[PDB]
Structure 1
Amino acid sequence: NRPNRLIVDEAINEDNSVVSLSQPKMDELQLFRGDTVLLKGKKRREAVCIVLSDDTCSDEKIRMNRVVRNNLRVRLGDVISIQPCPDVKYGKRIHVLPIDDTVEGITGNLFEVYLKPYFLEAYRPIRKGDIFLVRGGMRAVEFKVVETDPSPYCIVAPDTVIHCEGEPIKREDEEESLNEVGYDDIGGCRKQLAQIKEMVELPLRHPALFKAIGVKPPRGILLYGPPGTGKTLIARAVANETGAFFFLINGPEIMSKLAGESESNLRKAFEEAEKNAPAIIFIDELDAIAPKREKTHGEVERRIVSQLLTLMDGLKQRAHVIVMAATNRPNSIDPALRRFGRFDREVDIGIPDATGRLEILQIHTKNMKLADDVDLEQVANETHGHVGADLAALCSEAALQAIRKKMDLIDLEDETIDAEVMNSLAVTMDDFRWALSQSNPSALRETVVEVPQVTWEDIGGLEDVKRELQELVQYPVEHPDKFLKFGMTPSKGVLFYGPPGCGKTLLAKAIANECQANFISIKGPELLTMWFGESEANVREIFDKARQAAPCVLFFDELDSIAKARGGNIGDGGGAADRVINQILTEMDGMSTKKNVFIIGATNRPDIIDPAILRPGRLDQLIYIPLPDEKSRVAILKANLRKSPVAKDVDLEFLAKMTNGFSGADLTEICQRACKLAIRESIESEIRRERERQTNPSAMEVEEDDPVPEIRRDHFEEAMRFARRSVSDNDIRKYEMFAQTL
């Protein structure tokens, strides 16, 4: 049909019960008097109402009726097109079971009252499955059979009221049992849900495609990744919408112990579905029944893993009843992915973003009145990194806490809890936010959903550094043909100068967060001075890490520290040192050439770390990402003092000019020392004042928040005099000249 969807408005006819059949229904199709436009529904649902229509009188282009829309569960503006439907059955005689809920709670014989209105004025034709309006229960009747041995399509007479099974339906049929909190815009991931639906359909509705492709031994979908979340309970509202098949209900599996019988029934179900068309019934307690090499180091867990491998390698692509995401424990999942079915493909899982939080908030608002002016954008922003079951659970808890607080503050609510009082005392957006802050998501941290050690603005300046990072991001995505016709991409590796704590790791993390990347923030003497021998060992470890986490920007900062100047040319130690140096040269001369392995080293001198790479020998282009020069030490000290207690007169420019030779963290140490000295002075003054007050009730008091509530400029100058400047002026000029001449 059409690729752009629309929404269907209300019916043109004012009366909802007047659902006039369209002229096209009787024109394109031979719509007789006893049949109307048969509406297709979800999970193999179909309903047609016998109503006489006059196409020659008035062809009203009205929309669907409200009752018809509710019964058929027709989407708003769905493309009403006739396509091949191979999942429709037929029958001869059926038993029209009455509603069990209407029988209970009715005074006297409810069957006599039900049959009184069933024969005449029942609003139901002569067929099985007709729902009738009942008083009480406040629930819908829509049940899906996971695997029914019999068929669901058969005609039934209305004059014979057949007895039901006697079991009332307590569960809310319209809703879904699983995915209670794990609900996002498309159920977590649109791509993953689409892939699951396609696997469920094509393997069950297009067996010819599988036969021509020849993948018979393929199991199906056994996903991982989203383990432990409400994605563990993501079976319903995705399979409930997809529905379930019939036949081959289950094995007996009733011994309550099932030592080897659990494996026997599992193998039988795996083999039975390979030649049948049963539904993919999600395994209840899938991790519990199948330890999957996670529970015990004995035989049960390994046996579970092996049985999972056999089932994934022993089931055809017809049912694929495999738990996804959290199938087994995340640490040791079942071998259903290790065997056929997920051994070559991953799951397109959507990350927890503000979209999932907003969808959960919308679902909650539809379910209950959160607030009159609930800031769902604020809720989504506060739980942007946490979306899914955690976000919905936290929002529900916050709303419940806010509503409870509002009800308690409104009155005692111990004699007559007014429904208007509770609904009006909605969970205020501020109150809900406060309760959510008091609450927590399932994840240990909501900020752990991104890779960001430092903000892009936290790294002061970095103008040419950010320029180089953006160029690397773009020319590889913008103009990759420009690089290809131009040859190869530029070499990596920066050489910073000055003191340590230059922010190279911080700037790299800032860029990676701005690039939504997990930069491999490498340490110092952790690649060259490798602990497993020569530098080649750590180089290969980093290569494997970058290949498994591409792009993992191997931020091998502090090349001067990376070398660590091992030395020791005596006996076998000299051999080890020479091997380490040669391995470092080899890694710098060919390594994992992907994942943007940029090593922003520290350049204490021209030969302090790898003079050959410092010369244009190893690096064809020693691309040092220049940063804009700022008094970032002054700004950092200002932020720290704001975090502490220094105010009033602060000759920050007058003092920072004395030692301008800083590398961000260089002057921060002096600031920290001055802050510590000021805090010690304040504590001493407080102790002296307390002693004076103890000696005499009115002797002394506290001057301010600190003995020096302003900047302890005297203490700062005293610390500076006790310490020394970072470098001399002649040495600084020589270093600047050396950097410029290169």
Structure 2
Amino acid sequence: TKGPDAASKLPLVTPHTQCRLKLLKLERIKDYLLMEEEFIRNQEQMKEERSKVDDLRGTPMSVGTLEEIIDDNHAIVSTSVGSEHYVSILSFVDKDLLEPGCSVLLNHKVHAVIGVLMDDTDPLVTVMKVEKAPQETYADIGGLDNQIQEIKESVELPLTHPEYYEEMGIKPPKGVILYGPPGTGKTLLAKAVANQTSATFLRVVGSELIQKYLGDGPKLVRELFRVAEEHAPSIVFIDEIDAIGTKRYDSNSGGEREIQRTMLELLNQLDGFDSRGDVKVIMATNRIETLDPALIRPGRIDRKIEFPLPDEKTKKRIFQIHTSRMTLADDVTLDDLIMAKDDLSGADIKAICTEAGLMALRERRMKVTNEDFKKSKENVLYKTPEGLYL
């Protein structure tokens, strides 16, 4: 129960326009930051037994794996080179806190237990934590109201109002899979969750839990969920999970068997024998049909959220959101682009806006226009026989 790690983020200046009010808000943020900096400086400018204890502690302390603690002052430790020694335990160590497998600390020369180092989290899993917070609030997601509602009910309401569920003896969904075509808000709705959540967010990509050696992928998955459970509440976002989790066929190769083994370790973590803490999982997928049923099972993935290509009103929302910060001209009616019944993702709409801005800049004009938007729409979109029906 170390506690939530959160992600420090500065306030948001409501007026996106360049005006004095924005200047005042930013100046207030800056002046508070300056006061904090000077306070730290003044603390350190106005500022024995433990020092000698640390001197007695080895200078280049080594890290070794405790194994089969014995007696009350003698334990067997490992040197991380396979060798193991019947070392002694100084009084400095906590005791009643050493457990087998714990990465204790050893004096370099005499090899005596002198520390416990209960923070031996692998770098591969420490990197995949979220310390910043992307500035994609839910107000940057045009439409997707139902999807936002589902994910809020899954990963936000259980933390902000944990009385509704206890009031009817219901466990909220622990798993969500966001599936859809290539670019519809699947990753925005994880960015927004990270931005607006007080829980430890853990980015991951399915193609990252796979490791070169044997038994390392499952070990990494176990470590990832162990840290996600130590820090609680926590959310684990596995983007593009079809990297690992595809159908479990009868393998003939060895790498494929190892990948499936990693997938089974993930399945056991999601819903295994023992239990699961307050760790909530959000997977993302382009092609859900190819995923294994055991993974899509509605005990590991309680909610499945489709992100279809936006309809007309959602498309209008996307254009509004992505042209808000643009000096749109009064000649532009963002309806001609909406009406055309062509596959337009939110990514396609943003690319359309960017290309319209670039067309204006090419024409030497800083204010976009309708012809610019038409040209951008034509030149951004890259990609049944006639008369066969009707």
TM-score range, shorter chain: 0.5 to 0.7
- 1:504 and 1:231 mapped to 2: Cα distance? 46
Pick one of 547, 555, 558 that aligns with 2:237.
555
CA contact (8 A) 2:239 2:283 kept: yes
Q: AA paired with 1:655?
A: L
Correspondence for 1:471: 157
Cα shift at 1:655: 1.1
Q: Distance in 2 between matches of 1:668 and 1:451?
A: 22
Q: Which has the higher contact order (CA 8 A, sep 6+)?
A: 2
Pick the aligned partner of 1:672 from 332, 354, 367: 354
Query: Residue 490 of structure 1: which of 173, 181, 185 is its match?
Result: 173
Q: Is the 8 A contact 1:313 1:339 kept in 2?
A: yes
Aligned-residue offset at 1:568: 11
**How big is the shift at 1:464?**
3.5
Q: Cα–Cα, structure 1 residues 544 and 660, in superposed 2: closer, same or farther, change >3 Å? A: farther
Residues 301-323 of structure 1: CA distance to partner in whole angstroms, max 9, x if unpaired?
659xxxxx989679xxxxxxxxx
For residues 340-378 of structure 1, give each alpha carbon's deviation from its aligned partner in whole angstroms, at most 9, with x where no partner exists.
9x99xxxxxxxxxxxxxxxxxxxxxxxxxxxxxxxxxxx
- Give how far 1:658 is off: 2.3
Change (3 A) 1:634 1:491: same
Q: Residues 594-637 of structure 1: CA distance to partner in whole angstroms, max 9, x if unpaired? A: 243222332524x32223443xx463662236789775554444
Q: Retained in 2: the 8 A contact 1:558–1:600?
A: yes
Structure 2 Cα separation of the partners of residues 232 and 472 of structure 1: 40
Match of residue 44, structure 2, among 233, 238, 261: 233
Higher Rg of the two aligned structures = 1
**1:622 maps to 2:282:** no
**Separation in structure 1 between the aligned mates of residue 221 and residue 50 of structure 2, nearest angstrom:** 49
Distance 2:52 2:375 in 1: 77
Does the CA contact (< 8 Å) of 2:133 and 2:194 recur in 1? yes
Per the alignment, do residues 552 and 498 of structure 1 end up closer, same or farther by CA in structure 2, a change over 3 Å counting?
same
- Determine which of 378, 382, 388 is the counterpart of 1:723: 382
Q: Which residue of 1 aligns with 2:276?
A: 593
Distance 1:292 1:454 in 2: 51
User: Contact 1:493 / 1:600 at 8 angstroms: preserved in 2?
Assistant: yes
Equivalent of 1:526, from 194, 208, 216? Answer: 208
Q: CA 1:719/1:585 → structure 2, altered by over 3 Å: closer, same or farther?
A: same
Residue ranges of structure 2 left out of the alignment (5+ in a row): 1-34, 63-88, 95-113, 119-129, 385-390
User: CA separation in 1, counterparts of 2:349 and 2:55?
Assistant: 55
What is the CA–CA distance in structure 2 between the aligned matches of 1:633 and 1:532, rounded to whole Å?
46
Paired with 1:466 and 1:620, the residues of 2 have a C-alpha distance of 18
Distance 1:583 1:556 in 2: 14
Amino acid at match of 1:471: L
RMSD over aligned CA atoms reads 5.0
The two structures have a TM-score, normalised by structure 2, of: 0.54
Tell me, in whole angstroms, the C-alpha distance in 2 between the residues paired with 1:659 and 1:566: 38
Superimposed CA distance per residue, residues 195-222 of structure 1 (whole angstroms, 9 cap, x where no aligned partner): xxxxxxxxxxxxxxxxxxxxxxxxxxxx
Give, in whole Å, the separation in 1 of the partners of 2:330 and 2:151: 36
Letter in 2 for 1:233: E
* C-alpha contact 1:520 1:554 (8 A) present in aligned 2: yes
**2: CA distance, partners of 1:645 / 1:536:** 51
1:511 aligned to 2:193? yes
Partners of 1:568 and 1:633 lie apart in 2 by 44
Q: Cα distance 1:637–1:584, how it changes in 2: closer, same or farther (>3 A)?
A: same
Specify every segment of 5 or more residues in structure 1 that has no aligned partner in the other structure, as ranges: 1-179, 185-228, 237-265, 272-289, 294-298, 304-308, 315-337, 344-447, 687-703, 729-742
**Cα-to-partner distance string for 1:275-319 (whole Å, 9 max, x where unaligned):** xxxxxxxxxxxxxxx8999xxxxx85659xxxxx989679xxxxx
Higher-strand-fraction structure: 2
Following TM superposition, by how much is the alpha carbon of 1:457 offset from its aligned partner in structure 2, in angstroms?
1.9
Q: Is the 8 A contact 2:151 2:176 kept in 1?
A: no
Please name the residue that 1:279 is paired with: none
Q: In 2 relative to 1, CA 465–571 (structure 1 residues): closer, same or farther, beyond 3 Å?
A: closer
**Is the 2:136–2:188 Cα contact (8 Å) retained in structure 1?**
yes
Q: Distance in 2 between matches of 1:565 and 1:717?
A: 38
- Counterpart CA distance in 2 for 1:449 and 1:613 is 28
User: In the superposition, relative to structure 1, how do residues 609 and 662 fare at CA in structure 2: closer, same or farther (>3 Å)?
Assistant: farther
Query: Where does residue 712 of structure 1 map in the other structure?
Result: 372
Instruction: Decide whether aligned partners of structure 1 residues 582 and 600 sit closer, same or farther in structure 2, where only a CA change above 3 A counts.
Output: closer
Equivalent residues in 2 for 1:305-316, closer than 5 Å: none
Question: Do the aligned partners of residues 234 and 552 (structure 1) sit closer, same or farther apart at CA in structure 2, a change above 3 Å counting?
Answer: farther
Q: Distance in 1 between matches of 2:245 and 2:177?
A: 15
